[PDB]
Amino acid sequence: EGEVTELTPCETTISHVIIGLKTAKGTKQLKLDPSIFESLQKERVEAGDVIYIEANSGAVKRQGRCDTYATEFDLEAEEYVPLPKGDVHKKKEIIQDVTLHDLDVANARPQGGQDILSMMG
């Protein structure tokens, strides 16, 4: 998690994506699986945006722009968010309770899918 300071795909197609995330406690350079580049492009991630990336799934959520760039324009339709406080890499060991019905309903219908039948569903 952090503000994006650099987003550079490395061509061999793309072998990997090098990203730079900034927080109050420093800067970290990360090598991303090339499949995450599609997620980053879909989320419209640019330098100065505050994002988080899931290590296990590659999911990207762009949760606004950094408030340090709030004065770059006098009127933009943007949601400006503070810079994250902790480290870029956050680890948490959690215990979550689920029921068998939750697993049943998760497998009743497909999720996502870029096909036309999936989108119409």
Binding site: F73, L75, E76, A77, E78
Partner: protein, 111 residues
Amino acid sequence: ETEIIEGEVVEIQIDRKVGKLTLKTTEMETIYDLGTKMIESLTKDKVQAGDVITIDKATGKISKLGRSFFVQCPDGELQKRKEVVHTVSLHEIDVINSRTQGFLALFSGDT
């Protein structure tokens, strides 16, 4: 809390993207440097000089409430910080979060 910009449009300029927007009240006049998203919002909803509009700054929600030269131009400050209070029922929360575009079910049944 939200920031609400209500005024009369004086001049709107968009060039191949960068743009400027000039808004006035009965007490003050200002020129704004526009971003890409606000430029897109102002292009989608046709805004020309003389229109009295209100803008929600965070969302680009532009609603034209008439033309002035018919509604009188706003008087006080152009940019106002407003406190908006919503009372939302539990059913409304459930329906909005039931599915994508699920709020439509609040009006057409189909829950």
